[PDB]
Each structure stands twice: as structure tokens, then as C-alpha cells.
Amino acid sequence: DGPEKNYERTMAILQIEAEKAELRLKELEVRRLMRARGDGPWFHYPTIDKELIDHSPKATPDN
Amino acid sequence: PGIVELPSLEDLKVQEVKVSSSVLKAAAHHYGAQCDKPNKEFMLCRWEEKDPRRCLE
């Protein structure tokens, strides 16, 4: 292989590996924020579904 | 937390219907027909307000 092909093939390799490296660092920060604040799709632990509530008038009024 | 607001003892005075349950039982069917309107207004208030203090009148 000529030097140019290896050289530009190297840059293509470096671009892929640098983009992957940045994403790995951004995922760690997103995970830290989502776990601490709970405002994201991850670490979203279930709560009781409000559709299980019965809103019909009851036997007694105060409720 | 705040103060539970309560009506005064003078707001809670009304002439009572001091007859026994067998008397209420005997008249209940005709009582249901005759006194339906104030009765059903009061029950609507109770299930809507969910508060006895809001339906005293």
C-alpha cells in the first residue's frame, strides 16, 4: 500500500475512534444526570398507575 | 398546617326530628315521595362538596 492510502485510512480510523470516545464520555455524564435527577427515560422506576383509581360516586360522600 | 375551620354551636342548631326508627320506617315510602327535592339537593351537595361544613344550609 502506498503512503497516501495508509495515511488517509489512518485518518478515517482516527475519526471513528475519536467519535466513539466522545460518545462514551457523554453517555457517562448523561447517566450520572439521569440517575441523580430522575427526569429521563433511564432509571425511571415505576409508580402506581392512576388509571386503577375508581372515580365513581361512593357509598359515603366524603372521599 | 392551618386551623380546621368549624361552624359555631349556634350554626348547628335546628329543630330535630325526634321520632324513633319504627316511625321513620313506617313513613319512609311516603317521605321519599314528598320530601324528594330538598333531600336530593342536600345529597348532591354532600357528594359534590365532600365536606359537611359546606352543606349545613
Side-chain angles (χ1 to χ4, degrees):
Chain A
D1 279 314
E4 306 95 330
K5 172 170 181 208
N6 186 63
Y7 188 94
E8 300 181 329
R9 181 178 65 207
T10 299
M11 296 183 84
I13 288 162
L14 283 169
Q15 166 172 85
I16 283 154
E17 294 292 311
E19 279 163 350
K20 291 200 299 198
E22 298 286 13
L23 289 166
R24 286 199 200 89
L25 292 163
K26 267 207 289 173
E27 183 178 1
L28 272 173
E29 181 58 24
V30 171
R31 277 166 62 163
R32 181 190 75 66
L33 288 172
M34 282 205 217
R35 188 156 203 164
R37 302 192 300 208
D39 58 338
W42 308 340
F43 315 98
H44 186 258
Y45 310 139
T47 57
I48 292 166
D49 175 7
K50 74 183 178 64
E51 292 306 293
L52 288 177
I53 293 160
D54 190 14
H55 299 289
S56 286
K58 305 296 188 298
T60 69
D62 302 337
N63 54 21
Chain B
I3 305 300
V4 182
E5 174 60 11
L6 291 179
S8 76
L9 284 187
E10 190 276 331
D11 305 348
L12 297 167
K13 293 181 176 67
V14 74
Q15 293 179 356
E16 302 293 306
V17 178
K18 293 186 286 185
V19 300
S20 302
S21 51
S22 61
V23 176
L24 300 176
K25 183 67 180 293
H29 276 83
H30 281 299
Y31 171 66
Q34 292 307 123
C35 305
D36 174 71
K37 181 164 185 304
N39 281 4
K40 293 283 169 75
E41 276 184 274
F42 170 76
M43 296 297 246
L44 183 68
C45 181
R46 293 293 284 101
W47 275 265
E48 280 183 342
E49 297 291 331
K50 316 173 180 266
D51 189 346
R53 306 166 298 189
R54 305 275 64 83
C55 304
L56 290 170
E57 288 304 306

